[PDB]
Amino acid sequence: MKLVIEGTIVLKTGMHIGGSSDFSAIGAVASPVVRDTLTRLPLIPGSSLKGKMRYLLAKELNNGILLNEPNNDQDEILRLFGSSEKDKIRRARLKFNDIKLSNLAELETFNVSSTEVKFENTINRKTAVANPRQIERVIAGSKFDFEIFYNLDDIKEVEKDFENIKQGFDLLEFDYLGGHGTRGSGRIAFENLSVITAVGNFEKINTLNEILGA
Amino acid sequence: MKLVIEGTIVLKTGMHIGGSSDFSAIGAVASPVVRDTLTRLPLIPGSSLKGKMRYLLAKELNNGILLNEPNNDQDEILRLFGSSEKDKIRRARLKFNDIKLSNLAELETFNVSSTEVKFENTINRKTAVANPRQIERVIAGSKFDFEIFYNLDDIKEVEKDFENIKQGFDLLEFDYLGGHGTRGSGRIAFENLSVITAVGNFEKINTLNEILGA
Amino acid sequence: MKLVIEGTIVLKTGMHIGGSSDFSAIGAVASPVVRDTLTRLPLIPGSSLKGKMRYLLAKELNNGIDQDEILRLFGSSEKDKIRRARLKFNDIKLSNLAELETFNVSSTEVKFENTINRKTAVANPRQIERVIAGSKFDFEIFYNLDDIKEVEKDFENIKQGFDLLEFDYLGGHGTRGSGRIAFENLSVITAVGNFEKINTLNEILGA
Amino acid sequence: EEVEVGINRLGVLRADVDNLGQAFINGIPDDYLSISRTATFSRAMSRFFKNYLNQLLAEKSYKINVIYAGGDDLFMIGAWQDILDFSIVLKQKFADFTQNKLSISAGIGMFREKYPVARMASLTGDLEDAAKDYTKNAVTLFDATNVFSWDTLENDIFVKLDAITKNFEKLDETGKAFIYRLIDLLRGVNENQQINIARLAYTLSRMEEKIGKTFAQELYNWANADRKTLIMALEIYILKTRE
Amino acid sequence: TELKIGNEKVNSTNFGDFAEKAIRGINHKPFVNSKGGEQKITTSKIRGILELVNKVYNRVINTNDVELSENILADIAYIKVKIAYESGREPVVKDFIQRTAFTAAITDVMNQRTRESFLLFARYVESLIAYFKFYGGKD
Amino acid sequence: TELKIGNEKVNSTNFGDFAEKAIRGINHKPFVNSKGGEQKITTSKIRGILELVNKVYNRVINTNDVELSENILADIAYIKVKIAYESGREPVVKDFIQRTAFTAAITDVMNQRTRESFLLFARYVESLIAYFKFY
Amino acid sequence: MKIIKLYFESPVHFGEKRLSESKITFSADTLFSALMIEAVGLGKEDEFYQLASNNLVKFSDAFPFIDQYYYIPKPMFNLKLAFKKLLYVPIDSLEDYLSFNLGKLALSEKVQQHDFKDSEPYNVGTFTFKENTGLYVLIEQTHPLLEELLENLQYSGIGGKRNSGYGKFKFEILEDSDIEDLFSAKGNRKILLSGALPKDAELEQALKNASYLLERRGGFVQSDTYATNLVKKQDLYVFKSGSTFENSFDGDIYQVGKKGNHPVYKYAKSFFLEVS
């Protein structure tokens, strides 16, 4: 069986992610936000979510600090997010996806664009001359309905895997998702969290949905 | 009698398949996607689709794990995807084909190219410094009309063969097709599946057509 | 007295045919495609086209259960019965290099590919040289009009073999998406002697 | 199977003495000219090839099967490591025996484990013919496009190979992906000469802090002065160090 | 197939050599910013110039016709605008742009509006960045 | 693709050259301020004009449709009004607008209500200020 | 005396002992065997044999030729006296005698696959001619019959590996007078130009001061009528084409098959270039 980890990511702050691949004007945004280029709808890359979740979860596990490569995590993190060390290679149980902006109609209901420009500057400490920059940034309260595929390979380890997954989401609630996070952006939260089967049925599906629905 | 499995692959995310691993440039897109070099239209090789289908389909059969050489896994897989064992060889009934992008007209109506560049990096966690990464990716919403020739060797096996083919197609819907899939790329979705004859007419084509087109 | 079956072979996919014993460098293309040894122009050997037509025609007749038709088209060296081959194939050279120069692309490419071991999950890359798609191939096939009462069934079998080869690869790794060809601009002309009903041969084959 | 260090290939040596004809017919000059001197000359040549070839292959356990030897003809099939490491030994011992005035040419070929010997011998004979076509002493490494003189092969290729093997051993994470990108640039530089030299300089200063301060500038120097040598040096480096 | 800079033409035999001569002429006579000391352009600005070139180079290499399309030439003219803007801001950028002669190159790309001219320009700038990192790098 | 100024046209291969010629027209024969003195326009006025355009540019390059919306073109009309007002403020701004023909371009954008016409106009304004700062 | 020039647009396989290797040119009885097999294709084989038996059809073997240079194998003398590597000399440069490269030999690797079994490879040695070269065949007193047969042979193919897929050619006569006077000349030593063998009562008179090599000349009978199998030929041994003879001899078309349902002939008639 494979399981699908359905949910949504709601933004409490800006969450500027990414770099185009677009030309810039000389009075407009530098470093614009990354977009799904067919629809020009803002996007969370699955690589960003996977990397931040992996870093936070392998910071909590390995209690304290981590200073090593991704191949030197414990077997929970290696079995959850893949590995590439030379002989003890482990296929990733989790498959993330590119997350498009999902509630565009409810953003347009309040009569505003899907993104914003946030004006910044920096002052030189000796000459007090400012240096403005403009960053494109997604507006707060933007929801991102995501889904993550889980590969049910060992039925006696799925309890610890979903415990670790809920641990990683609960850590990522108290941290930014990408870009200028320490300077007041990126703070997200996780809602509508559930797990469903791909095809068939998993026997203890309720013990996974309860460990994520709290 | 030879049958043609006609359909369409629809990209839900990136699908970065293929590329020369030569140097491209210094500050430009690295590892481009594979293309049909007469048109330089982005391409799905039939080798990628066949290999991923064989891996997933031979993981669902031999229920659970697939820890074996590809020349001997399961007899249904052997008769569907070919064989090369010494005293035991049988032909593949399936003939995959190089798939070319078909909806470039629809992508030109949206004023977007058929490919994009995703910007990535990594954070070397001891020094916390970044290491950027540009990968070419086909855009989402790109359609890939494919044809697979089915060699109907025996009438008594064709319904089980398309039951397995629909099984593998359902398995690919919850997995990625090529490249950095666990980082939010490669997600596909098969649609408009049908089976039509090459020459003449098959009599019980309907049971095949709607065990596969459902 | 003798006929010329002329057409074009248009590639829809790769068609990597052949293996030379040329030494492969370590980071470079192993198994290069067959070429002319003096022009270095990519090529379909006539033995490859002949063998693939013989394969598909022999697998077609005697359905799932060889015959005089196949031996009389492509020869025989059986210990009891020996028949002269009516067909005469030729090595097919690439014709539309003037057209492929217009598109500003070489007539050949490298396809990059690997396998993955299922236990150890380590990839294993390979490069294979391959003709590009959209290539044309002017071919001449000569028929020995030795018997008049059999030429109709013979040309029916030749067009049947062409149509069977239309839905199957021509050479190399065809099961992984290569080798798909199509036959267009098929015509039959005589060169010596004079065949009266050349038009029904043209219509049984160019239909 | 006894070899467990390099690529699982079978290396083939075909050698012959070039300019042996007029040297055997009219070599000893007309002033101090003797008949028994010519007898010693030819009998010593055949004597050398037979007994010194068996003893030079016996004193070190070379994994080489000799098919047949002689002045006109030589054919040995073995592991490619021992064949490559024995070709220089045979060349230098022939130079010592003949006081380095009889030249010698050879051809090294390399084939997989299960390969036919007839096509093997014909291909390596083609290789050594291309070596003797140069019309002096030389050797072909694995292909007719790579023809090197014996001192050129020995000196240049083996000091570059030994320097590369010293440098990339002490490096903990550099090889072999850097070497494959380096070979990609150094074989692209044949056709596109300028931009690959620029990319080469960019990568060498990129990995100046990683591969070594002096080795990167040595690679940049070698890739302009004696280029084609370093490609073969890197290729036989990876062929040696592949597990 | 041959791009003009000053009184000497550059093609696909000399752009690495011309850019090497230009970079090594930037050293041994650097720019002075109207104060006592010299000042040369940093890594980040020339990577900005290279990124501006690469934003078109990523699209041109997958094109068909030997003459560029109009949206490519629009972006080339806008690159010329951006280089003229950033050079007027800081005089250290103006010195690098004039001495490693960039505006003349991009204008003569705009005259002969062909694919090979833009590729020659792009490999010229790529070699220019390459030799700047090769000589006196601060990594 | 198309944007008319007088009887003389500027298109999307070409705006840099008319920005050259427009600024080099502002220089070499500058404004006279009803005095014998010389006067050229300051940085902040023209770049307030740039920020006036870039309040619209950030919502056009972000979008998809080939025709401009009514909110966007309403703000384009607002740009034309603000041009008229800050022309009425200072005579040097009036002659900068009259020589570097800006009202002509903004009326061209209001006539052909396409996305690419405004994007060309934004290219032209950015190039105007680029060649202002270059000299 | 006429010329028969042969322009090959495809590779050739002129085997001499085995399939894996090939030869640059083809012999005279090779061309005569091709003409006999094509004539029994047309049913006119009997009067073609009666033409070639009574000297009105008398051709040499194939020789290399490059642009306006016609070659022969290096005639080998009792010369009492570097150019020792050269195998072919121009046909008119014999008086000067008392650079050159047409094509390159290739080896084509093939296979035969079985469906429920492992494949088996076989390799074919080939030769490909350069763009402005080929082969030429000497002939005297051209006949309408042989002009009709070579017009018909070029759609069946001279060469070995048929009908996969090598030997094909287009011919034209293009007679010459710069080299007809060579063959009208008479000298003291006459060189051979075809694989020949004298009759039994004149081999001694033909063999006086000669310089020759024998060549075995056999193979398998290529027909569907000779005795229900693949029977070998009586291996006739003929003189090599680069021979010299001080006195002339006339060859015969020997019957080297005497057990099947039809005779198998082998052309061994002489063709001399008389020189001082």
Quick one: chain E helix, strand, coil %, rounded to 5? 65, 5, 30
Strands (E), chain G: 2-8, 58-66, 69-73, 88-90, 104-112, 120-128, 133-140, 164-165, 169-172, 189-192, 214-217, 236-239, 244-245, 252-257, 264-268, 272-275
Cβ-contact G217, G237 below 8 angstroms: yes
* 3-class DSSP state of G224: coil
Q: According to the 3-state scheme, what is the secondary structure of chain A?
A: CEEEEEEEEEECCCCCCCCCCCCCCCCCCCCCCCEECCCCEEEECHHHHHHHHHHHHHHHCCCCCCCCCHHHCCHHHHHHHCCCCCCCCCCCCEEECCEECCCHHHHHCCCCCCEEEEEEEEECCCCCCEEEEEEEEECCCCEEEEEEEEECCCCCCHHHHHHHHHHHHHHHCCCECCCCCCCCCCEEEEEEEEEEECCCCCCCCHHHHHHHCC
How many angstroms separate the CA atoms of D57 and G64, rounded?
47
Among D135, D137, D79, smallest CA distance to D107 is for D137
Q: Are G241 and G213 in contact (CB under 8 A)?
A: no
Q: Do C116 and B51 touch (CB under 8 A)?
A: yes
In 3D space, the residue among A54, A62, A53 whose CA is nearest the CA of residue A9 turns out to be A53
In this structure, what token pair is assigned to residue B179?
């490249």
**What are G98's two structure tokens?**
């008392």
Structure tokens, E137: 């790098």
d(CA G245, CA A60): 101
**Sign of the Cα pseudo-torsion (E6, E8, E12, E17, in order):** negative
- Rounded to whole angstroms, the Cα distance separating F131 from F129 reads 5
D213-225 helix and D227-241 helix, angle to the nearest 10 degrees: 130
Q: Own/partner pairs for B68-74, CB < 8 Å, 24+ apart?
A: B68/C118, B68/C119, B69/C117, B69/C118, B69/C119, B70/C115, B70/C118
Cα–Cα distance measured from residue B135 to residue B17, given in angstroms and rounded to the nearest whole number: 10
Return the amino acid letter for E117.
S
Beta bridge partners of E94: none
The answer to whether D117 contacts chain E (CB < 8 Å) is: no
Please check if D136 is assigned to a binding site.
yes
H or E element in which residue B44 lies: strand B41-44
Phi, psi angle pair for D114, to nearest 5°: -105, 90
Indicate the helix (H) or strand (E) that contains B151: strand B143-151
Q: How far is CA E42 from the centre of its chain?
A: 15
* CA–CA distance, G97 with B159 (Å, rounded to integer): 81
Q: Which two tokens stand for residue B116?
A: 């994009």
Write the residue in A21, A23, A26 that is nearest to E75 by C-beta: A23
Mutate to test the interface with G, among B79, B83, B88, B89 (most CBs of G within 10 A): B89
Which helix (H) or strand (E) covers residue G32, if one does? helix G28-42
DSSP state of B3: E
Q: How many CA atoms lie within 13 A of A116 on its CB side?
A: 15
- How far is Cα C10 from Cα C33, in angstroms, rounded to an integer? 17
Whole-angstrom CA distances from D65 to B121, E111, F33 are: 53, 67, 101
Tokens at C20, concatenated: 């030379």
Angle of the E43-60 helix axis to the E115-134 helix axis, nearest 10:
150
Q: Is G135 helix (H, G, I), strand (E, B) or coil?
A: strand
Within 8 A of B69 by CB-CB distance, chain C residues are 117-119
Contact E55 A21 (CB under 8 A): yes
Q: Name residue B44's beta-bridge partners.
A: B99
> Helical H runs in chain B?
46-60, 75-81, 104-109, 158-173, 205-212
Nearest to D16 by CA among D133, D142, D119: D133
Q: Can you say how many angstroms the Cα of residue G34 is from the centroid of all Cα atoms in its chain?
A: 10
| C171 neighbors C180 (Cβ within 8 angstroms) | no
Q: Which of B131, E139, B124 is nearest to D208 (CA)?
A: E139
Backbone angles phi, psi at G72, to 5 degrees: -135, 160
- Calpha distance D160→D166 (Å, rounded): 10
- Could you tell me the two tokens for G115? 């469906």
Alpha-carbon gap, residue A134 to A33, rounded angstroms: 11
Element (H, E) at B7: strand B2-11
Phi-psi region of E18 (alpha: psi -120 to 50; beta: other; left: phi over 0): alpha
Tokens 């970079």 found at: E23
Question: How far is it, in rounded angstroms, from Cα D142 to Cα B107?
Answer: 49
Which burial class, exposed, middle or buried, applies to E44 when counting CB atoms under 10 A from its CB (0-12, 13-18, 19+)?
exposed
Interface test with C, best of G110, G164, G220, G224 (most C CBs within 10 A): G164
Is residue E88 helix, strand or coil? helix
**Which residue is associated with the tokens 């063999």?**
G207
Token reading at C45: 């050997």
Separation of first and last alpha carbons in chain C: 23
Cα–Cα dist F40/F95, whole Å: 10
Burial of E124 (0-12, 13-18, 19+ CB in 10 A): buried
Two tokens, residue D75: 């054919």
CA distance G131 to C38: 9
Residues 6+ apart with CB under 8 A from C175: B50, B81, B82, B92, B94, B95, B96, C169
According to CATH, what is the number of the domain D1-153? 3.30.70.270
Q: Is B125 on the interface with G (CB under 8 A)?
A: no
Task: Supply angle C-alpha C123, C126, C129, rounded to 5.
Answer: 160
> Would you call C68 exposed, middle or buried from its count of C-beta atoms within 10 A (0-12, 13-18, 19+)?
exposed
Task: Tell if the CB–CB gap between A29 and F53 is shorter than 8 Å.
Answer: no
**B87 shares contact with chain G (CB less than 8 Å):** no
d(CA G50, CA G57): 9
- Rounded Cα–Cα distance for residues A154 and E68 (Å): 56
The DSSP secondary-structure symbol of B114 reads S
Do the chains G and A touch each other, judged by at least 3 C-beta pairs below 8 angstroms? Answer: no
Q: Residue A88's Cα: distance from chain center in Å?
A: 27
Contact G10, C90 (CB under 8 A): yes
Which residue, chain included where needed, has tokens 């690419």? Answer: F116
Q: Which domain holds residue F84?
A: 1-135
Q: Integer distance in angstroms from the first to the last C-alpha of chain G?
A: 20
* Residue D184 CB partners (closer than 8 Å, separation 6+): B21, B22, B23, C27
Burial level of G272, CB count in 10 A (0-12/13-18/19+)?
buried
Angle at F13 between CA E89 and CA F49, to 5 degrees: 45
Three-class SS of residue G15? coil
Contact in structure between A90 and A72 (CB atoms under 8 Å): no
What the block records as the tokens of C109 is: 């490419």
State the structure-solving technique. Answer: cryo-EM
Contacts of C85 in chain G (CB under 8 A): 162-163
Give, to the nearest 10 degrees, the angle between helix E91-99 and helix E43-60.
50
For the four alpha carbons of D50, D55, D58 and D64, in that order, the dihedral sign comes to negative
Q: Is A28 left (phi over 0), alpha (psi -120 to 50) or beta?
A: beta
Cis omega (within 30 of 0) on the bond before D176?
yes
Q: Give the integer Cα–Cα distance in Å for G18 and F1.
A: 71
What radius of gyration, in Å, describes the C-alpha atoms of chain C?
19
Question: CA-CA distance, E34 to E40, in Å (whole number)?
Answer: 13
Max alpha carbon distance in chain F (Å)? 51
Phi, psi of C43 (to 5 degrees): -150, 145
Phi-psi region at E8: left, alpha or beta (left = phi > 0; alpha = psi -120 to 50):
beta
Name all contacts of G45-52 with Cβ < 8 Å and 24+ positions apart.
Answer: G47/G145, G48/G145, G48/G149, G49/G253, G49/G265, G51/G143, G51/G145, G52/G253, G52/G267, G52/G269
Residue G255: phi, psi to the nearest 5?
Answer: -85, 110
Contacts of A38 in chain B (CB under 8 A): 107, 110, 112, 139-141
Chains F+C touching (3+ CB pairs under 8 Å): no
Contact A46, F73 (CB under 8 A): no
* Cα–Cα distance measured from residue D13 to residue D17, given in angstroms and rounded to the nearest whole number: 13
Can you give chain C as a three-state secondary structure string?
Answer: CEEEEEEEEEECCCCCCCCCCCCCCCCCCCCCCCECCCCCCEEECHHHHHHHHHHHHHHHCCCCCCCHHHHHHHCCCCCCCCCCCCEEEECEECCCHHHHHHCCCCCEEEEEEEEECCCCCCEEEEEEEEECCCCCCEEEEEEECCCCCCHHHHHHHHHHHHHHHHCCECCCCCCECCCEEEEEEEEEEEEECCCCCHHHHHHHHCC
The tokens describing G47, both together, are 């009067």
Taking CA atoms, F43 is separated from E34, F4, F48, F50, in Å, by: 22, 26, 8, 10
Domain total of chain F:
1
- This structure's resolution (Å) is 3.0
| Backbone conformation region of residue B15, classed left if phi is above 0, alpha if psi is from -120 to 50, else beta | left
CA distances from G66 to A102, G103, G134, G172 (A): 76, 10, 7, 15
Cβ of B26 within 8 Å of Cβ of E130? The answer is: yes
Tokens of D49: 């090839």
Phi, psi for E128 (deg, rounded to 5): -65, -45
Peptide bond into G163 cis (omega under 30): yes
Are D90 and D17 contacting, i.e. CB atoms less than 8 angstroms apart?
A: no
E78: exposed, middle or buried (C-beta count within 10 Å: 0-12, 13-18, 19+)? buried
Tally the residues of chain F.
135
Instruction: Report the DSSP beta bridge partners of residue A160.
Output: none
DSSP state of F118: H
Burial D198-223 (b: 16+ CB within 10 A, else e): bbbbbbbbbbbeebbeebbebbbebb
- The number of beta carbons lying within 10 Å of the beta carbon of residue C163 is 14
Return the amino acid letter for A81.
Answer: F
> What are the structural domain ranges in chain C?
1-207
Q: Subunits with at least 3 CB pairs below 8 A relative to chain B?
A: A, C, D, E, F, G
What is the radius of gyration, based on Cα positions, of chain A? 19
Cβ burial, residue D2 (10 Å; 0-12/13-18/19+)? exposed
Residue D182 assigned as binding residue: no
> In whole angstroms, what is the distance from residue C55 CA to residue F53 CA?
70
CB atoms within 10 A of CB A106: 11
Please report the DSSP string for B165-201 in residue order.
HHHHHHHHHTSBSSSS-TBT--BEEEEEEEEEESSS-
* CA quadruple G142, G143, G148, G149: dihedral, nearest 10: -80
**Element at G205 (helix H, strand E):** helix G203-206
Q: Do C121 and A89 touch (CB under 8 A)?
A: yes
Q: Give the residue from chain D lying closest to C26, CA to CA.
A: D235
Q: What is the DSSP letter of G187?
A: -
Bridge-partner residues for A3, per DSSP? A150, A197
SS3 G151: helix
3-state SS, chain D, equals CCCCCCCCEEEEEEEECCCHHHHHHCCCCCCCCCHHHHHHHHHHHHHHHHHHHHHHHHHCCCCEEEEECCCCCEEEEEEHHHHHHHHHHHHHHHHHHCCCCCCCEEEEEEEECCCCHHHHHHHHHHHHHHHHHCCCCCEEECCCCCEECHHHHHHHHHHHHHHHHHHHHHCCCCCCHHHHHHHHHHHHCCCCHHHHHHHHHHHHHHCHHHHCHHHHHHHHHHHHHCHHHHHHHHHHHHHHHCC
* Alpha-carbon radius of gyration of chain G: 19
As given in the structure block, the two tokens for residue B196 are 């039509």
Structural contact between residues E106 and E80, judged by C-beta atoms closer than 8 angstroms: yes
